Enzyme design. Structure first.
Site, short mmCIF file in Angstrom:
data_model
loop_
_atom_site.label_atom_id
_atom_site.label_comp_id
_atom_site.label_asym_id
_atom_site.label_seq_id
_atom_site.Cartn_x
_atom_site.Cartn_y
_atom_site.Cartn_z
N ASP A 193 -1.19 5.84 -5.36
CA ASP A 193 -1.68 4.89 -4.36
C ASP A 193 -2.05 3.52 -4.90
OD1 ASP A 193 -2.53 3.72 -2.01
OD2 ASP A 193 -4.45 4.80 -1.98
N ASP A 233 0.82 -1.24 0.00
CA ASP A 233 0.00 0.00 0.00
C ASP A 233 0.84 1.27 0.00
OD1 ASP A 233 -1.98 1.96 0.39
OD2 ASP A 233 -2.33 1.48 2.52
C1 LIG Z 1 -5.59 7.26 1.26
C2 LIG Z 1 -6.33 6.38 0.27
C3 LIG Z 1 -7.02 5.25 1.00
C4 LIG Z 1 -7.74 4.30 0.05
C5 LIG Z 1 -8.33 3.13 0.82
O1 LIG Z 1 -9.21 3.40 1.63
N1 LIG Z 1 -7.89 1.87 0.66
C6 LIG Z 1 -8.52 0.78 1.43
C7 LIG Z 1 -8.21 -0.54 0.76
C8 LIG Z 1 -9.06 -1.62 1.46
C9 LIG Z 1 -8.70 -1.78 2.93
C10 LIG Z 1 -7.23 -2.22 2.99
C11 LIG Z 1 -6.35 -1.11 2.37
C12 LIG Z 1 -6.73 -0.87 0.92
C13 LIG Z 1 -6.59 0.25 3.01
C14 LIG Z 1 -8.05 0.68 2.88
C15 LIG Z 1 -8.88 -0.41 3.59
N2 LIG Z 1 -6.10 4.43 1.88
C16 LIG Z 1 -4.95 3.76 1.64
N3 LIG Z 1 -4.31 3.74 0.46
N4 LIG Z 1 -4.41 3.08 2.68
C17 LIG Z 1 -5.28 3.31 3.68
C18 LIG Z 1 -5.33 2.91 5.01
C19 LIG Z 1 -6.42 3.34 5.81
CL1 LIG Z 1 -6.48 2.80 7.49
C20 LIG Z 1 -7.46 4.15 5.34
C21 LIG Z 1 -7.43 4.56 4.00
C22 LIG Z 1 -6.37 4.17 3.16
#
Ligand SMILES: CC[C@@H](CC(=O)N[C@H]1[C@@H]2C[C@H]3C[C@@H](C2)C[C@@H]1C3)n1c(N)nc2cc(Cl)ccc21
Length: 377
Positions: free
Chosen positions: A220, A34
Site C-alpha cells: 500500500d 494509492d
Molecule cells: C487500507 C489502508 C488505508 C490506509 C489509509 O487510511 N490511508 C489514508 C491516507 C490519507 C487519506 C488519503 C489516502 C491516504 C487514503 C486514506 C485517507 N487506506 C488506503 N490505502 N486507501 C484508503 C482509502 C480510504 Cl477511503 C480509507 C483507507 C485507505
C-alpha cells in the site's frame, strides 16, 4: 519511459501525488497515488484545504451516472456523486481515456491541511471498488481502452519534500539495481501477498507464519507505516527492543505515542537492527527476501515545533486489518505491479537511502516449506 521518471511529488507523511487532467477542456489536478483502494475520487467542491477542485460544469465531456457513493473509514469518511469523464496523465503515456470519477462533495478527516493533492487514484482492483465491483477502476479502464500493457511500477524516494516515479505500462531499468524478484498476488482485490518468514537481524522469529498474514498482507502506497498484526507486532518490537540494548527508550516510543530525539546530527543507526521479510516466491517451496534499514523505519519528523533537535517516529505499528507494506517498505525498493502476470516484483531501488555499512537488499532464492499454509482462509 523518461517521459515518466520523477512524475511523483509530495510532502513527508502526506503521500505521493501525480499530475492528472480531467474533462474537456482539461482541468489539471494533483492526485494521490494509492495502491490500497480502487476508486478514482476527487474534490468537487471548494473545501478550504483544497488548492483546486473538479468543476463538472466546465466539462463538455462529463456524464452523470446519477448515483451517490458513501465511503466511511475508522476516523472519517468521503462521499460523492458518480460520473465519467475524459482522463489523461501529462507525465504519463500519451493517451486519453473515459473513466469513472467520483466527485467528492462532503468529507471528514480525508483531506490533509497543507497538502498539495485534491483527490486519490485508487489503483487496486474492482472487488474493493465502492459502492461495488461493477464500478470499473481507473486502471482497468486504461488497459481496456488503449494498448497500454497491464502493469505499472513505483519508485518512491521521499526526500519535507518527496519525489518518485510511476511508470505506467512498463519498467524503467535505471530505477533499480540487481534483479527483480516476484511474489504472487494471492487474490485480486488489494495487492495481497504472503509473507512467509520474518527475521530481525537474522534471528528469525519462529512464529506460525500464518500470524504474518492475519488476516491479510498487502502492498500500500497510501500508508506510511509498516503495519503488523497485533501478535506479530509484539514479537518484532520485543526483538527490535533487544537488538538495541545499547540504548533504552520509554514504552511509548515503540507504541508510536511519543517520539525520540538526539543532538542535531548524532543518531547511531548501528544500534538498530535490519528487518527482513521473506515473501512467497514464484515456484513451489521457493521464497526470496527483502531487507530494510533503520533509515526506513525510523523517520525524521518535520515538526521540531516545540523541539530543536533530530526527533524520529517509530514507523512500525500494529494492525487489526493485517500486515500493510507501506512507504517504510516501498521506499527501499522499485516495486512492479505485474497485474498481467498476477505478481509483484521487488528490486533494490536506485534512489533508496543507503549508508556506509548496511544496504537495503533483495535476495534469493531460499528454501521455504509449507508456504501456502501461511495464507488466511
Ligand atoms: C487500507 C489502508 C488505508 C490506509 C489509509 O487510511 N490511508 C489514508 C491516507 C490519507 C487519506 C488519503 C489516502 C491516504 C487514503 C486514506 C485517507 N487506506 C488506503 N490505502 N486507501 C484508503 C482509502 C480510504 Cl477511503 C480509507 C483507507 C485507505
Amino acid at each position: 519511459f523518461v517521459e515518466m521518471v520523477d512524475n511523483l511529488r509530495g510532502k513527508s507523511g502526506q503521500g505521493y501525488y501525480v499530475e492528472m487532467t480531467v474533462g474537456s477542456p482539461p482541468q489539471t489536478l494533483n492526485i494521490l497515488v494509492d495502491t490500497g483502494s480502487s476508486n478514482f475520487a476527487v474534490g468537487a467542491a471548494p473545501h478550504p484545504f483544497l488548492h483546486r477542485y473538479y468543476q463538472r460544469q466546465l466539462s463538455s465531456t462529463y456524464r452523470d451516472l446519477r448515483k451517490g457513493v458513501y465511503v466511511p473509514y475508522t476516523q472519517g469518511k468521503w462521499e460523492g456523486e458518480l460520473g465519467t469523464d475524459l482522463v489523461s496523465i501529462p507525465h504519463g503515456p500519451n493517451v486519453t481515456v473515459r473513466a469513472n470519477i467520483a466527485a467528492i462533495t462532503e468529507s471528514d478527516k480525508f483531506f490533509i491541511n497543507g497538502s498539495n493533492w485534491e483527490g486519490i487514484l485508487g489503483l487496486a482492483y474492482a472487488e474493493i471498488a465502492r459502492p461495488d465491483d461493477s464500478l470499473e477502476p481507473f486502471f482497468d479502464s486504461l488497459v481496456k481502452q488503449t494498448h497500454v500493457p497491464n502493469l505499472f511500477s513505483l519508485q518512491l524516494c521521499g526526500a519535507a519534500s518527496v519525489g518518485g516515479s510511476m511508470i505506467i505500462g512498463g519498467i524503467d531499468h535505471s530505477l533499480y539495481t540487481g534483479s527483480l524478484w516476484y511474489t504472487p498476488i494471492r487474490r485480486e482485490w488489494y495487492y495481497e501477498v504472503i509473507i512467509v518468514r520474518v527475521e530481525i537481524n537474522g534471528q528469525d522469529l519462529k512464529m506460525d507464519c500464518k500470524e504474518y498474514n492475519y488476516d491479510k498482507s498487502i502492498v500500500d502506497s497510501g500508508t506510511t507505516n509498516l503495519r503488523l498484526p497485533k501478535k506479530v507486532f509484539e514479537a518484532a518490537v520485543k526483538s527490535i527492543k533487544a537488538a538495541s540494548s545499547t540504548e533504552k527508550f520509554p514504552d511509548g516510543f515503540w507504541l508510536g505515542e511519543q517520539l525520540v530525539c538526539w543532538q542535531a546530527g548524532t543518531t547511531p543507526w548501528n544500534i538498530f537492527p535490519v528487518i527482513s521479510l521473506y515473501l512467497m516466491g514464484e515456484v513451489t517451496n521457493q521464497s526470496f527476501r527483502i531487507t530494510i534499514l533503520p533509515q526506513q523505519y525510523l523517520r525524521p519528523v518535520e515538526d521540531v515545533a516545540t523541539s530543536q533537535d533530530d526527533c524520529y517516529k517509530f514507523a512500525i505499528s500494529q494492525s487489526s486489518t493485517g500486515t500493510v507494506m507501506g512507504a517504510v517498505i516501498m521506499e527501499g525498493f522499485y516495486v512492479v505491479f505485474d497485474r498481467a502476470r498476477k505478481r509483484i516484483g521487488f528490486a533494490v531501488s536506485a534512489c533508496h537511502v543507503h549508508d556506509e555499512f548496511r544496504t537495503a537488499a533483495v535476495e534469493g532464492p531460499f528454501v521455504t516449506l509449507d508456504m501456502e499454509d501461511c495464507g488466511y482462509n
